[PDB]
Design a protein around this nucleic acid. Structure first.
Ligand SMILES: NC(=O)c1ccc[n+]([C@@H]2O[C@H](COP(=O)([O-])OP(=O)(O)OC[C@H]3O[C@@H](n4cnc5c(N)ncnc54)[C@H](O)[C@@H]3O)[C@@H](O)[C@H]2O)c1
Ligand SMILES: [K+]
Lengths: 273, 123, 26, 309
RNA sequence: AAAUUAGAUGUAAAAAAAAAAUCUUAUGAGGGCGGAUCCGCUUCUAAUAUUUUUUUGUAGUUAUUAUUA
RNA sequence: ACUUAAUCUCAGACAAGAUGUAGAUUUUCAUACCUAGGUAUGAAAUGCAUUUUUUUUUGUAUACAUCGGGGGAU
């Protein structure tokens, strides 16, 4: 009267994307196209409402405003909303002004203090630039270290583990005392360690994998829960399960590591990025 | 009074009499905008269909798993659907500590910080 | 005869926000 | 194929990309200069009317989407990082967190009439007026389940100010209207008092406040500024009260006058306002939710702390 | 206790086709019969309404699952 | 019924889950083991209590079905 299926409970631990997706070539051109229509329909900018006359801020604003040719905005190039040539608001194909690289470059060049405390323009050589933002692709991205969490910051990374070999998610049999939600926590701690700031979403499983029995050999009904990591790293030392290695993989890399049937069952849980 | 006059000037510029007038396009300029508008609204459709496709696919994965769970018996001497009836509970889901504020506070950013990820975090 | 009002919006800029973490968004 | 024969023979969409040599020779600025004259105006000179005089009037008004329209507003300028965040990570967590499995052939639930009718053998019940809403005086909206077709999201935000003392010092209303302007990027509409209280020196039907409503992307940007740059700076801040909620998915709370000037748009030019004139605001966050617990579950996904009180 | 603002119902929106019957109408067939459009009886067709009625059909599209090549 | 005067009753029900208790020591299941079976270990199954409408208890069905003041015990 032995049970036919062996109920297991896994955990699909994921690191959400930490960066916004790259804007398509059309999304960039569209924003810029609408920023110049706003120039023609918004009220003018009154510097007297933010800067008071004859101050370190006013003088600094006037100098850089002349380099922009009067345009108070820094990310729309040179466009006069009023005048004979107002119609020429559209930009020709193959332009650099609409890109996001040129936008950040201009906004940073406008943050450096150009007027000393005494009101005199700082020499062109004595002007200290501003600290630029960090690059989107970190060192791990260039090296390709799959055991790192700061890799592919614009994609979701899934925790996959090897067992003495087949790659899979942290799994384990469900005892009679614990449910799926409180069994997935004990297994993750006994497999990847306790130095990960993880959050098991809830009690509902997001995917399942069923291995039919062999009329016999007991079948397995694996139920996966969604896990979200916020800090830390997986630690496979002193693990109770026969785990050897681990690696954080993307959605496109999972299908190259996991089996075809094992992947076809968890693919539905995947997200856009 | 001087400062209030500045504030009033800010409004005097926003009056309907001062704000710029409605745009005036030709044909080729209007048709150029008609396509940019026709392609943007279609782009949103492609993003709306994709976004709603993933939500439906992720949802169907839950239905399938829970449907299987409903008809399971175990583990051991536990009636059918026990794990199912225990998984459909909403204990603390609608409370104050439901979602950890460390995960919800971290939003997407154009560029990462000086330390993208903290691997040295200890319990 | 329903009057068609117009939107009265002030001038707006694009700003780079650098959090304490060093991360930047616009 | 005959079906493909019915499509337009000459398609602009199926034309090749513009030539680089043509791009080099296309100079809109040289045409106006080389012309040395003004091109004749086109005979099409339709301009949107200033008034809507009916659906059958000879001259009709175009939709707001028309760029030449009077109510046209330039489209999006960027993607609010909190909308991409919610739609990228938190859309599925709320759907997975709050999920009830319906069996495959579950019969569709039939809604019962909320304005009951009298049914019985008494001849009076026939033509009796429908009963009143049971419980509350007004029917509350019924909660919808968080589905993959119904994800609670932020819809609009209303920032309102009430300055009673402005009836004596008219400048308190000018400053309040400007602070609410830079804070939200729109022109607030002045409000008036509706009651008469002599103890408080309140007179009815006199301008005593201002209110703005930000919709779409503007409302997602404002939330980020509030959550990540304003609220974390309020001294000894505990969190939004857990009692907030009108029973329909809208969250309301208020800021102090010293916390309104923490807004980056107000601290930059804080010296341009007269002293002790920056007011406190009433922020009302309207969501697509249909419950108090759904809204509090939605805001927690965006990083709002809630405290018990 | 008493100031302002925000809220406070639900459903539907691809498309139907067809048979008979219960009435009611018609400046419909210039219907037929008595005394073209006047009148009380009158069949047929059409339209509105009513049956829980006899049903037939309920696709296509996107996705999931199962079989099949 | 709506409105008017006065009076009376109710303000909660079920399913699941959880929490314990004496058991019988049979079956299933998980681990420490031994050598695929037994050996144990616990857990469940089981009977009666027990918690439950905003609670550190969710769901269904319902008008979320109730709030302060005052007198007591912790
Ligand atoms: N909008 C429609 O025409 C439409 C069509 C079918 C269904 N629906 C239903 O309505 C819901 C919402 O409609 P939606 O998904 O089309 O809204 P949306 O997210 O595409 O638009 C939201 C707002 O942000 C702007 N926006 C959209 N994409 C942007 C981007 N990439 N960058 C910057 N700004 C952007 C839009 O102009 C709009 O003002 C849908 O989920 C669906 O349920 C809507
Ligand atoms: K879209």
């Amino acid at each position: 009267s032995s049970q036919i299926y062996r109920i297991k409970s896994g955990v699909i631990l994921t690191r959400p994307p930490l960066l916004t997706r790259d804007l398509t070539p059309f999304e960039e051109s569209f924003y810029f196209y609408q920023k110049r229509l706003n120039e023609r329909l918004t009220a003018p900018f009154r510097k007297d409402f933010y800067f008071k006359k004859d101050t370190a801020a006013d003088l600094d604003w006037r100098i850089k405003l002349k380099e922009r040719h009067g345009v108070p905005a820094k990310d729309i190039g040179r466009y006069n909303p009023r005048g004979r040539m107002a119609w020429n608001d559209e930009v020709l194909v193959g332009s650099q002004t609409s890109s996001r690289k040129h936008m950040v470059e201009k906004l940073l060049a406008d943050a450096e203090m150009r007027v000393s405390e005494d009101g005199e323009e700082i020499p062109a050589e004595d002007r200290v630039p501003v600290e630029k933002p960090m690059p989107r692709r970190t060192e791990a991205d260039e090296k390709g270290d799959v055991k790192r969490l700061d890799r592919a910051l614009d994609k979701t990374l899934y925790l996959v583990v090897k067992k003495k070999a087949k790659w899979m998610f942290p799994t384990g049999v469900v005892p009679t005392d614990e449910g799926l939600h409180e069994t997935a926590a004990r297994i993750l701690a006994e497999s990847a360690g306790v130095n990960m700031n993880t959050w098991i979403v809830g009690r509902v499983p997001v995917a399942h994998h069923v291995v039919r029995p062999v009329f016999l050999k007991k079948g397995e009904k694996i139920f996966f829960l969604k896990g979200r990591i916020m800090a830390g790293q997986a630690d496979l030392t002193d693990n109770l399960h026969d785990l050897v290695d681990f690696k954080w993989l993307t959605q496109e890399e999972l299908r190259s590591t996991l089996a075809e049937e094992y992947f076809h069952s968890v693919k539905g849980m995947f997200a856009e990025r | 009074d001087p400062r209030i006059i500045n504030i009033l000037r800010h409004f005097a510029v926003l009056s309907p009499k001062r704000i710029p007038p409605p745009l005036r396009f030709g044909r080729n300029r209007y048709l150029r905008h008609w396509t940019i508008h026709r392609a943007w609204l279609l782009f949103r459709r492609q993003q709306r269909e994709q976004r709603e496709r993933i939500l439906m696919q992720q949802h169907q994965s839950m239905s399938n798993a829970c449907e299987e769970l409903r008809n399971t018996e175990g583990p051991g001497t536990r009636e059918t659907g026990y794990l199912y009836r225990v998984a459909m509970l909403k204990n603390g889901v609608y409370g104050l500590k439901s979602i950890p504020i460390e995960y919800a506070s971290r939003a997407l950013v154009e560029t990462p910080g000086r330390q993208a990820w903290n691997h040295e975090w200890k319990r | 005869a329903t009057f068609v009002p117009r939107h009265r919006r002030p001038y707006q800029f694009t700003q780079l926000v650098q959090l304490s973490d060093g991360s930047t968004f616009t | 194929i005959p079906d493909l024969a019915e499509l337009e023979t000459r398609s602009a969409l199926d034309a090749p990309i513009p030539s680089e040599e043509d791009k080099k020779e296309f100079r809109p600025w040289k045409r106006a200069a080389d012309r040395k004259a003004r091109l004749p105006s086109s005979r099409y000179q339709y301009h949107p009317p200033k008034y809507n005089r009916g659906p059958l009037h000879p001259i009709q008004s175009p939709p707001s989407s028309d760029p030449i329209a009077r109510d046209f507003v330039p489209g999006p300028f960027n993607m609010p990082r909190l909308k991409e965040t919610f739609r990228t990570v938190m859309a599925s967590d709320l759907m997975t967190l709050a999920y009830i499995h319906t069996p495959p052939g579950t019969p569709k639930k039939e809604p019962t009439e909320r304005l009951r009718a009298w049914e019985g053998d008494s001849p009076y019940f026939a033509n009796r007026a429908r009963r009143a809403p049971r419980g509350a005086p007004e029917l509350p909206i019924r909660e919808r389940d968080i589905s993959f077709r119904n994800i609670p999201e932020i819809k609009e935000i209303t920032v309102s100010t009430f300055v009673p003392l402005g009836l004596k010092n008219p400048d308190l209303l000018i400053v309040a209207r400007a602070v609410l302007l830079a804070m939200t990027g729109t022109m607030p509409e002045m409000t008036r008092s509706k009651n008469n209280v002599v103890q408080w020196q309140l007179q009815a039907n006199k301008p005593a406040g201002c209110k703005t409503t930000i919709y779409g992307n503007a409302a997602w940007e404002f939330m980020d500024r509030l959550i990540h740059l304003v609220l974390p700076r309020i001294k000894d801040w505990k969190g939004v009260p857990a009692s907030t909620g009108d029973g329909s998915g809208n969250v309301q709370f208020g800021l102090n006058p010293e916390d309104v000037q923490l807004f980056p748009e107000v601290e930059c030019n804080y010296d341009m306002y007269p002293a002790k004139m920056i007011p406190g605001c009433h922020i009302a966050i309207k969501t697509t939710a249909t419950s108090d617990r759904q809204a509090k579950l939605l805001l927690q996904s965006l990083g709002v702390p809630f405290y018990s009180n």
